[PDB]
Amino acid sequence: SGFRKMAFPSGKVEGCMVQVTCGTTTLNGLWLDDVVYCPRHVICTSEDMLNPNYEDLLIRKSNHNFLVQAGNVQLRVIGHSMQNCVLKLKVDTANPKTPKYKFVRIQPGQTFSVLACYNGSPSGVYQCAMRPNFTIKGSFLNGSCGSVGFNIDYDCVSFCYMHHMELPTGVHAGTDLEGNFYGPFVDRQTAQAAGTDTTITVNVLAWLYAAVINGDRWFLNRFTTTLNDFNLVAMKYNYEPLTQDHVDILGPLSAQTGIAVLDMCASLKELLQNGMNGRTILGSALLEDEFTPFDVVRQCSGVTF
Amino acid sequence: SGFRKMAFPSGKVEGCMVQVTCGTTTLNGLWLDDVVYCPRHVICTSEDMLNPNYEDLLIRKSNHNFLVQAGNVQLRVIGHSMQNCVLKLKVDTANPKTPKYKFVRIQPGQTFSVLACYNGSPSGVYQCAMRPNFTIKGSFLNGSCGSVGFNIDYDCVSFCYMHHMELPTGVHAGTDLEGNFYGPFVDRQTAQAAGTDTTITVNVLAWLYAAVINGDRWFLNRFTTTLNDFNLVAMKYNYEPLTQDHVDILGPLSAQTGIAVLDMCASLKELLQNGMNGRTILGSALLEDEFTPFDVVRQC
Ligand SMILES: O=C(Nc1cncc2ccccc12)[C@@H]1CCOc2cc(F)c(Cl)cc21
Numbered sequence: 279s280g281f282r283k284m285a286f287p288s289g290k291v292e293g294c295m296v297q298v299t300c301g302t303t304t305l306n307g308l309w310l311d312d313v314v315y316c317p318r319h320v321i322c323t324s325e326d327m328l329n330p331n332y333e334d335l336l337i338r339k340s341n342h343n344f345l346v347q348a349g350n351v352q353l354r355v356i357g358h359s360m361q362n363c364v365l366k367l368k369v370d371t372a373n374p375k376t377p378k379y380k381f382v383r384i385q386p387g388q389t390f391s392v393l394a395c396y397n398g399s400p401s402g403v404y405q406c407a408m409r410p411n412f413t414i415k416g417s418f419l420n421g422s423c424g425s426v427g428f429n430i431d432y433d434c435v436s437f438c439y440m441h442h443m444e445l446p447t448g449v450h451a452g453t454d455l456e457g458n459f460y461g462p463f464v465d466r467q468t469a470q471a472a473g474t475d476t477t478i479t480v481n482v483l484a485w486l487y488a489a490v491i492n493g494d495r496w497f498l499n500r501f502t503t504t505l506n507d508f509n510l511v512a513m514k515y516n517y518e519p520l521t522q523d524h525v526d527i528l529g530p531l532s533a534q535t536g537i538a539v540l541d542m543c544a545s546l547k548e549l550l551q552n553g554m555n556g557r558t559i560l561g562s563a564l565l566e567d568e569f570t571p572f573d574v575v576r577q578c579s580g581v582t583f
Numbered sequence: 584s585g586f587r588k589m590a591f592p593s594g595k596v597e598g599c600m601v602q603v604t605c606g607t608t609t610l611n612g613l614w615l616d617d618v619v620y621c622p623r624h625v626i627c628t629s630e631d632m633l634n635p636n637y638e639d640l641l642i643r644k645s646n647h648n649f650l651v652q653a654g655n656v657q658l659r660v661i662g663h664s665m666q667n668c669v670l671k672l673k674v675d676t677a678n679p680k681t682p683k684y685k686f687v688r689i690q691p692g693q694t695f696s697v698l699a700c701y702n703g704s705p706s707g708v709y710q711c712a713m714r715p716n717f718t719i720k721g722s723f724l725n726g727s728c729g730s731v732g733f734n735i736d737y738d739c740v741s742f743c744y745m746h747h748m749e750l751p752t753g754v755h756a757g758t759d760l761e762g763n764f765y766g767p768f769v770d771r772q773t774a775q776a777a778g779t780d781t782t783i784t785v786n787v788l789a790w791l792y793a794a795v796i797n798g799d800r801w802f803l804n805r806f807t808t809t810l811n812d813f814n815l816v817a818m819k820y821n822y823e824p825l826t827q828d829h830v831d832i833l834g835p836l837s838a839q840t841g842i843a844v845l846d847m848c849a850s851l852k853e854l855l856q857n858g859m860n861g862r863t864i865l866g867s868a869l870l871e872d873e874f875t876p877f878d879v880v881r882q883c
Pocket residue numbers: 319327418419420421422423442443444445464465466467468584
């Protein structure tokens with residue numbers, strides 16, 4: 279029993295964290311095979327970030343300008359190139375701890391574990407979701423750039439995020455491992471704002487199923503709804519529309535608990551129109567939206583890595 | 584910026600997880616140097632659960648009864664001994680991934696990361712606090728016994744918990760790595776109940792400081808209180824009494840935010856009296872008590 283916000287074991291990713299220093303900037307790099315990936319803004323000083331021409335800044339750099347440190351051993355950079363907002367530093371040593379891995383781009387609503395690092399050293403692991411506005415509500419301090427987000431599928435690490443910056447509201451923005459930003463954000467010191475965030479409806483439904491699995495069932499009601507009527511109500515409370523794909527993904531949880539998706543939708547609908555009435559669900563007074571249906575199945579069944 | 588429930592990186596502990604099988608029971612073991620630590624209840628049968636005599640059950644066991652598996656390699660048990668409720672299986676191979684480590688017994692209110700494992704394989708990492716009633720509100724399924732709780736302050740792992748059982752209310756009980764249970768619990772299937780749980784007051788205060796550091800101020804007020812008046816109010820809400828030790832530990836956060844401890848105590852009293860009025864603190868509608876003052880300083 280119990281339901282916790284749970285991250286993937288971080289070991290396979292810790293063995294890849296290095297420190298990348300270029301001039302006065304020090305941040306984190308991800309060492310996989312003979313390549314170290316890090317944010318391209320490491321090549322920027324103060325003036326540069328205001329209006330940066332990364333291609334021109336990188337052409338002025340040499341391999342020796344990049345100081346890469348893996349543990350207490352300095353790696354020698356033998357090549358450098360840029361792929362979108364990520365800088366790829368070719369090194370002369372392949373990481374002996376390189377796990378089986380893939381670079382994946384996730385969609386809003388998807389969750390992942392973040393290994394927050396400082397000076398190439400892992401300091402914490404936490405779970406989060408890619409918000410519908412493409413930000414993450416992370417916990418990052420100065421020096422955390424280059425920290426990565428990942429999922430594990432069997433023994434394969436899927437790297438999906440690399441931390442680049444903190445927006446004025448305290449939320450975070452970054453890219454996939456190919457340097458493409460999640461969201462309408464740029465790696466430049468300029469006025470940027472995240473769009474109005476919405477609630478990940480399919481994830482709230484999955485968490486309501488986790489609560490029923492754990493014996494917390496007061497919010498259940500006799501009612502059901504159409505997907506169209508539910509979406510009309512959901513739009514009014516800044517909840518993402520629920521698609522037939524989402525109803526299908528919730529299928530196993532529906533079968534396990536005996537509560538149809540549209541039956542659970544009518545419970546969520548009443549929760550939005552009337553509140554929790556002084557009650558909690560899984561020890562929470564707010565509806566949690568950072569657990570996907572897969573996360574609920576994984577945690578409530580005990581899948582290992 | 585931002586404030587998350589954050590666990591320590593689990594890598595140093597994953598390299599220590601092994602599977603321990605005794606007859607029909609399979610659970611997790613912690614392999615450090617040439618010793619595998621696991622709950623002694625792995626040696627129990629069906630009839631030896633209501634009132635097992637562990638000393639007598641262990642004397643009837645031989646090294647070849649214990650099957651230890653580290654990854655896809657079977658380890659050879661060359662000795663066995665018991666220390667309180669923990670079984671110690673001496674093996675013929677020292678774990679090459681043994682990190683710098685210590686065994687520490689924690690106090691209620693202290694937090695730690697849990698690496699939940701099944702069949703010696705890590706499945707998840709989460710952050711927990713030792714409740715004032717000495718249980719943990721974990722997330723554990725059958726087979727999770729032997730999963731450990733730890734903290735990693737620097738490069739040294741302080742193992743503080745090993746999971747033993749789930750109580751009837753769904754909360755969990757276990758021991759330090761010397762086999763001593765946290766709480767008035769025994770590793771028997773006898774009638775056991777956790778005491779009424781209370782809120783870790785010092786941790787809520789630390790989290791209110793984390794919120795101020797992150798730009799939350801709506802809950803602040805112009806009041807201060809005495810420690811005695813605060814304790815009289817807080818205890819009516821099933822909150823733990825706040826001691827002078829707790830006021831002292833909150834000192835650096837008080838200095839950093841410019842809000843005295845007793846000033847923050849008066850904010851907490853008002854939060855308890857009014858509720859949150861539709862507002863949240865650090866994205867939460869309830870007062871969080873699983874962040875210690877040390878966790879807040881470290882994360883912020
Ligand atoms: O965001 C930045 N680093 C931080 C990241 N995460 C968390 C933080 C918390 C506090 C202070 C910095 C934090 C850097 C420095 C500030 O300016 C920029 C601007 C940029 F366009 C980019 Cl791509 C990066 C940065």
